Amino acid sequence: MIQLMLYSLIITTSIIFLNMIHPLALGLTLLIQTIFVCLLTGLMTKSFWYSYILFLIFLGGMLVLFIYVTSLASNEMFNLSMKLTLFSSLILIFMLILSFIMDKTSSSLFLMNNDMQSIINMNSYFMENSLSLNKLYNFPTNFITILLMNYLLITLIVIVKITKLFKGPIRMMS
Amino acid sequence: MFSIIFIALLILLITTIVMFLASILSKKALIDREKSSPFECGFDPKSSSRLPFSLRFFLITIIFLIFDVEIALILPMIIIMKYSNIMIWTITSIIFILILLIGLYHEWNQGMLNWSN
Amino acid sequence: SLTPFLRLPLTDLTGCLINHQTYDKCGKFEMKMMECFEAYGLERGKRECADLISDFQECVGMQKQLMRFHAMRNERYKQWLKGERKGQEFFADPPRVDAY
Amino acid sequence: MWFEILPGAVIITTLLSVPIYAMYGLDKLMIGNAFRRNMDERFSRVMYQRDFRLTDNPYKMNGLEQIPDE
Amino acid sequence: MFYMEFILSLIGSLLLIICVLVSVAFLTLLERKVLGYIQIRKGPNKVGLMGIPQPFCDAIKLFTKEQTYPLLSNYLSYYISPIFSLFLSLFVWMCMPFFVKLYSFNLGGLFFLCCTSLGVYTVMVAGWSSNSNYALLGGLRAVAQTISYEVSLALILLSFIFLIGSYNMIYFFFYQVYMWFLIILFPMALVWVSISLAETNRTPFDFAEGESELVSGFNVEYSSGGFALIFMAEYASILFMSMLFCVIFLGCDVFNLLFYMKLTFISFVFIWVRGTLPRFRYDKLMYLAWKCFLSFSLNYLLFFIGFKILLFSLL
Amino acid sequence: MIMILYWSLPMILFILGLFCFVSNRKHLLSMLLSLEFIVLMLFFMLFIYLNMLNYESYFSMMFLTFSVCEGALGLSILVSMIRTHGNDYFQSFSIM
Amino acid sequence: MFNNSSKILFITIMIIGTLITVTSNSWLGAWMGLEINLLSFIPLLSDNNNLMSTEASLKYFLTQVLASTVLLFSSILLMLKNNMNNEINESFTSMIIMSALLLKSGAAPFHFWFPNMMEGLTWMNALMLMTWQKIAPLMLISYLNIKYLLLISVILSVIIGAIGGLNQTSLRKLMAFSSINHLGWMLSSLMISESIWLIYFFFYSFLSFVLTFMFNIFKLFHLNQLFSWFVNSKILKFTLFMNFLSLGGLPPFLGFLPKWLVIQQLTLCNQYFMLTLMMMSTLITLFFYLRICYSAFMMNYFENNWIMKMNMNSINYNMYMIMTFFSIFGLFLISLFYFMF
Amino acid sequence: VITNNTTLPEESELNVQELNLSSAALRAGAFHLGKQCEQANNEFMLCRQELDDPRACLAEGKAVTSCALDFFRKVKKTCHEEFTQYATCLDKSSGTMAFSHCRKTQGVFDKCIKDN
Amino acid sequence: SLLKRAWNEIPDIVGGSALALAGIVMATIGVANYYAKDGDNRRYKLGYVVYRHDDPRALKVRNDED
Ligand SMILES: COC1=C(OC)C(=O)C(C/C=C(\C)CC/C=C(\C)CC/C=C(\C)CC/C=C(\C)CC/C=C(/C)CC/C=C(\C)CC/C=C(\C)CC/C=C(\C)CC/C=C(\C)CCC=C(C)C)=C(C)C1=O
Ligand SMILES: CCCCCCCCCCCCCCCCCC(=O)OC[C@H](COP(=O)(O)OCCN)OC(=O)CCCCCCCCCCCCCCCCC
Ligand SMILES: CCCCCCCCCC(=O)OC[C@H](COP(=O)(O)OCCC(C)C)OC(=O)CCCCCCC
Ligand SMILES: CCCCCCCCCCCC
């Protein structure tokens, strides 16, 4: 029931996100979108780690983007429309009705949770995020992690090169 | 996590009831023309706050974003120490923190952690 | 799986990225498919490993099992709409939670 | 002089001690066990499923009186 | 899951919310009394019996004064932000390690970091939507402050987690049965006290609400309920990081009254730093949390990585 | 039907995000936010794929790292617009 | 590359990312290699003293980020349906993978970013854009056995890249439209023989790498800058302009050989109609090559009077004239080669 | 999936008496149970690992449940009240039933086991 | 020369570098102590593992005292 509610909320916020001209409307819409996407991703995995990781990522990213909102397109008009509110309300109540009259066994995800796994699975009895995150630090794929460290260092070098700090601060009509 | 959703909705409901009770029991006086105006320390503003703001720490913000996704790859290895090869875990962990120290000390050497000015 | 074009030492890290060998129920089937993908090749394996490809595909993708389940669920609701299945006896006896 | 700081601090000490100790009563009123079952590990959750399968109360314990004489 | 649980989880969460709110009120009373006694003067003494119902005087007045309907503001975004600020500042308190099963937070550090990042989001939304220059400056100072302390707060937490081996804060109790972690982590007792004041926007890092650099910071257009929920959100954040100083550095036991005495003492320390040290500049805050705190966090993380490999071979 | 009942939704939301990315907007930062949305829906679809498999969800952080470095590249391009222009209007840039 | 060692670092990470892409046995490793290549190639192509180079970098960034996200989307769909890294029978998600690869490569009808962005570049970054950045999407097209979509891309690329290059008198956009026309010959060879594609790509990159050096050294950004270009002997300019007849496919020059091996391998594989469609395309490419060749074939020109001495680099002009000899008299090495057997 | 060609054990085979003790009663006396049922548990889990088929090792599961039932009858005949006190202490002493929370009743139960 | 300037102007960096060098030395000592004995064959094993007598992993099983 909660998964179908998250489906309906993600659909309604995606309709809202496709229709917003103002960057702050897009920012708040993608705030509630990443909240609902973080909860939905959690439902699929045995543990709740990557939802938390994705939330730290997408709250570390738009924290910067608001500073660029206040530095570029700080002055732009909001335009509320009754058509979008009526459309979102009608679609939202229609999908809550459709989710209430639906069989929730057929609409549930086939991905296995921590309790959907059987009792005979001895790997399920370990600590909940151990075997999932193991291959980041194991022998076949530590070199991809090495490549990611060097990639992030090269990324930082690129950011320093193409954002020249000695040219001055950035604003509109600089 | 389903209980956390319900208690988060209950906290949001309780705070909205608290704010609406603060609005209902507030003193209802008539709105003056210059009461609603922005403060600006007692004088006329000359400029709206929607005027563009100068950013002197753009490089620090993007370095913060890069370092935060670097934080997102450190948090696994608390769990991974008891279940992996100790040699590979130490090579990855000490090489991770030393590469971060090379990057941070190199940008300290260039002075890119200082605000543009 | 695919092939490395102009393969170098840089493909040794990439080659072990996503596979079913790490504690998965399907991987042995996948391993068998990889066996003929090492024997027949990538192009003769599309024709001479049609049995081993399909077993891995409906083992990890679970296509035929989920089509079976959705045919079992739709027939019960179809019998309820047609009136053959009573509303009180619409669902069967539930399994024990200690089962599976 | 300085002791008047202690009114206003003990209330922070007492009231924040309220939501733990009250549950140490409020479980014992209805659960019968002062500690409700923790669900951190998978095995504790599976054995909680076993207890709630055996009895409607998972905190009601089946002793040796359940076992038949033979 | 048993039905009674849900009921007792709801009851314990609501009782925790009510007790944290009244403890926020008496924390304002405690700050106004000892912060006076930081100087020569006294605290509130006349109203009520001995100043005890003084937060009730402060709460009756702020719930009855006229709501500001500002002119150039976006009122539909200005009205909602203190509600969300109080909502996350009370929602973070569900992470509290109970010895009973309140909530099985296996990932309490990540939950704490998420609510920590979200509280400053409410602060910077309330700063922008007031449509005042001082409010926008306080909001941008809050964004620069959280960009300064966020990665430093995370890496310092990881070092404590390494001493635990798990992300569940009740496992802090088993590793502190013989002694407190104040013996080992005294440089990050200082560093976590520095970060926790930057988390709660408190002196020496009070740039989001400045009384001399700006005029009340981002609270310049908030009055009579919006200011009240913003103020309780800030003080509940102060109570939460006082609790987290008591969890990590001190004993994580909750069945002793000495824990709540220690929490009142760490709250007194939070008042005590404000009454002694002057405020920084946020230029020096950004030069501090990027070149000193982050480097020390990475270095002592290396020290804990080596010590945990040394300890694991001996076991 | 099986492709319709499972994972048909994030294809539709990714198509809506792609249409939000290419729509006639005044500013580049709206396109950066649409990039963040299509990162979110690619995370959803990749997470469905990595959770059919049991213990291969470690890859889900690498995609986050490459996507954040994409966003950092876009943010630094947005800084480099100010080094040459005074604005981020897409009409103000050269069409040829 | 020029004026900084960090650009040499960016070239190193460029080579590393492209070789990570083309060696990947999974689409996800190829995707992250494309991310590394994009990360490497944004800072080269960015210059704050040029107002149009940043716009060209923005156009490249938006085009590659849109094409990389569609590529990962259809890769995830291919893993969702046919759970191995490839597909047994061809379907629509393979066409979405091929279309997202064709947006990276710059082939028609997804070609429109490519000469509109090349006006903002220098010549060395143009050479890196239309030679090395076509390694990674074209080598990933080889894993897909789709004939109609590739054939439509081939026909559209050879039609547009010939017709479109007639209007521009700027050498960068004209050479970009020439690279679109030579992309169609590469994609036509991609579904008959991967080795023949490698040979056409190597000789096309050789002719591009020698025609860039004539424009990079003397800074020839326009067609009339060729007419005003001073040489100390007009026979030297006559010989240096024979590389355009080489790139047009005229024998007995070197560039007849890769076109000829593509035509031989196409006729052995029983394709005749699209080969005939590519015969009419390369006449128009040779036609807008000849407008450059007007600047040296008439042997005497009404030239500007003030300039009297021509200037060049030492090592760059030394390396330029090794390859100009092999772009004219390169068919004498037909006996030495052993790839084509 | 399960088809008509695959055999299954009948309902008369699976209708035997099963251990219906709670979690605190199983955790109390858990260390003394495996010293008596070391042979059945190891054989059943070894043949459950490699055979990996629930139809196999059914008699091994019968032997495991019979050994556990015989041990619980032996506990029930002699000083049932000490086991009741230990199981009640282990249930009521902590959330996760750790043996370290109360050890006095564990000592009394081990003293009764050693005396009997 | 440069150590006195770094110890005068940035002393927390010098103290952190000493702590990190001590951590690198202790990591080397811990890895060498882990691999000096049979550290891969741990005494207590996660899960329920049973080995037959003819298995090659059977004679590697430790018989130490708790
Ligand atoms: C030389 O030149 C100069 C001049 O020329 C001569 C000048 O003139 C001036 C100008 C100067 C002057 C005019 C005077 C000088 C100024 C000063 C001395 C100012 C400096 C002093 C201070 C700032 C004071 C010291 C600071 C303190 C004490 C910190 C605390 C201060 C506060 C204001 C905090 C109080 C606010 C509160 C308490 C908010 C109220 C909210 C609540 C109480 C909410 C809590 C709620 C509860 C407890 C209960 C709620 C429960 C609920 C909702 C749930 C319950 C439910 C149930 C069911 C029970 C200057 C500067 C100058 O230089
Ligand atoms: C994570 C991000 C999430 C983002 C999405 C969040 C969405 C949340 C829901 C949004 C709903 C919006 C509804 C808006 C309705 C009001 C619109 C409005 O603007 O009202 C204006 C009004 C006065 O403002 P005005 O005069 O316009 O002044 C501005 C001039 N510059 O303003 C007002 O009067 C202020 C509002 C007063 C509301 C009072 C409601 C009536 C009372 C309700 C019951 C209270 C009961 C309390 C006691 C209970 C006891 C059990
Ligand atoms: C209005 C919402 C504000 C934002 C809340 C963000 C919470 C943290 C991010 C996240 O995904 O956390 C995953 C966590 C996962 O749970 P945990 O892993 O923390 O705990 C297990 C849970 C009963 C064992 C402890 O979920 C939440 O925090 C629930 C959020 C409810 C939101 C309600 C409104 C839609
Ligand atoms: C900088 C590297 C730290 C870790 C070193 C691990 C290997 C130590 C020596 C092992 C010899 C067998």
Q: Give the position of tokens 């543990």.
A: A47
Q: Which residues of E touch A126 (CB under 8 A)?
A: none
Across the interface, of F1, F52, F59, the residue whose CB is closest to C70 is: F1
The span from the CA of G43 to the CA of G10, in Å, is 8
Interface of B with F (CB under 8 A): 58, 62, 65-66, 68-69, 72-73, 76
Candidates G266, G170, G248; CA nearest to G204 is G248
How many C-beta neighbours within 10 Å does residue G321 have?
Answer: 14
Q: Are F50 and A43 contacting, i.e. CB atoms less than 8 angstroms apart?
A: no
How many C-beta neighbours within 10 Å does residue D32 have?
Answer: 14
The residue of chain I with its CA nearest to that of B98 is: I20
Q: Closest approach of chain B CAs to the CA of E254, in angstroms?
A: 22
F56/C70 Cβ within 8 A? no
Exposed / middle / buried, residue C64 (Cβ in 10 Å: 0-12, 13-18, 19+): middle
Number of domains in chain F: 1
**How many C-F residue pairs are in contact by the CB < 8 A criterion?**
28
The span from the CA of G176 to the CA of C82, in Å, is 67
Instruction: Say if E100 is an interface residue toward chain H (CB within 8 Å).
Output: yes
The span from the CA of B83 to the CA of E35, in Å, is 51
The span from the CA of H48 to the CA of H55, in Å, is 10
Q: Are I30 and E313 contacting, i.e. CB atoms less than 8 angstroms apart?
A: yes
The span from the CA of I26 to the CA of B90, in Å, is 11
Which range of residues forms the domain containing residue F45? Answer: 2-92
Q: Do G and E share at least 3 CB pairs under 8 Å?
A: no
The CA-based diameter of chain G, rounded to the nearest angstrom, is 70
**What is the secondary structure of A117-170 as a DSSP string?**
S-TT-TTTTS-TTTTTSGGGSSSTTHHHHHHHHHHHHHHHHHHHHHS-GGG--B
Residues, chain I, total? Answer: 66
C6/G139 Cβ within 8 A? yes
Candidates E304, A71, E181, D64; CA nearest to B78 is E304
Number of domains in chain B: 1
Residues after which chain C is broken (C–N above 2.5 A) are none
Which range of residues forms the domain containing residue B103? Answer: 1-110
Q: Which amino acid is at G191?
A: M
The span from the CA of G41 to the CA of G64, in Å, is 11
In a domain, residue B81? The reply is: yes
Three-state secondary structure call for residue A91: helix
How many C-beta neighbours within 10 Å does residue E97 have?
Answer: 20
Candidates G51, G69, A160; CA nearest to F70 is G69
Experimental technique, in short, is cryo-EM
F47/A162 Cβ within 8 A? no
The residue of chain A with its CA nearest to that of F46 is: A41
Q: Neighbouring chains of E at 3+ CB pairs within 8 Å?
A: A, B, D, H, I
**What is the secondary structure of G264-329 as a DSSP string?**
HHHHHTT--HHHHHHHHHHHHHHHHHHHHHHHHHSS-----SS-------HHHHHHHHHHHHHTTS
C6/G23 Cβ within 8 A? yes
Please tell me the number of Cα atoms within 13 Å of E216 on its side-chain side. 16
In a domain, residue B28? The reply is: yes
What is the CA angle I4-I9-I12, rounded to 5? Answer: 95
Number of domains in chain G: 1
Tokens encoding E178: 């013989």
The span from the CA of G223 to the CA of I45, in Å, is 77
The span from the CA of A143 to the CA of E113, in Å, is 29
Resolution of this deposited model, Å: 3.4
Mutation choice for I interface testing from A122, A130, A131, A139 by most I CBs within 10 A: A122
Q: Kindly report the CATH number assigned to the domain that includes residue B46.
A: 1.20.58.1610
- Using CA atoms of F38, F43, F44, F48 in order, give the dihedral in degrees to the nearest 10: 140
In a domain, residue B83? The reply is: yes
Q: Are G181 and G108 contacting, i.e. CB atoms less than 8 angstroms apart?
A: no
Q: Kindly report the CATH number assigned to the domain that includes residue F8.
A: 1.10.287.3510
Ligand nearest to the CA of E5: 3
Q: Closest approach of chain C CAs to the CA of A13, in angstroms?
A: 29
Three-state secondary structure call for residue A111: coil
In a domain, residue B19? The reply is: yes
Instruction: Say if C18 is an interface residue toward chain G (CB within 8 Å).
Output: yes
The span from the CA of A156 to the CA of G6, in Å, is 12
Q: Give the position of tokens 């009740």.
A: E170
Exposed / middle / buried, residue B42 (Cβ in 10 Å: 0-12, 13-18, 19+): exposed
**What is the secondary structure of E28-73 as a DSSP string?**
HHHHHHHHHHHSSS----SSTTTSTTHHHHHHHHHTTSPPP--SSS
Q: Which residues of G touch F37 (CB under 8 A)?
A: none
Q: Are E175 and E163 contacting, i.e. CB atoms less than 8 angstroms apart?
A: yes
Q: Are G24 and G89 contacting, i.e. CB atoms less than 8 angstroms apart?
A: no
Tokens encoding E194: 């520095």
Q: Do C and E share at least 3 CB pairs under 8 Å?
A: no
> In terms of DSSP H, where are the helices of E212-292?
226-248, 257-274, 282-288
- What Cα–Cα distance (Å) separates residue F49 from each residue in A104, C30, C60, E272, F57? 22, 16, 10, 53, 9
The span from the CA of A97 to the CA of A90, in Å, is 11
The span from the CA of E60 to the CA of E44, in Å, is 16
- What Cα–Cα distance (Å) separates residue G281 from each residue in D28, E210, E242, G157? 89, 71, 76, 9
Instruction: Say if A78 is an interface residue toward chain I (CB within 8 Å).
Output: no
Q: Closest approach of chain B CAs to the CA of A132, in angstroms?
A: 10
Instruction: Say if D49 is an interface residue toward chain H (CB within 8 Å).
Output: no
Q: Are G21 and G37 contacting, i.e. CB atoms less than 8 angstroms apart?
A: yes
The CA-based diameter of chain D, rounded to the nearest angstrom, is 77
The span from the CA of H28 to the CA of H82, in Å, is 11
In a domain, residue B115? The reply is: no
Helical pair E226-248 and E81-91, crossing angle rounded to 10 deg: 20
Q: Cβ contacts of residue F10 below 8 Å, gap of 6+? A: F41, F44, F45, F48
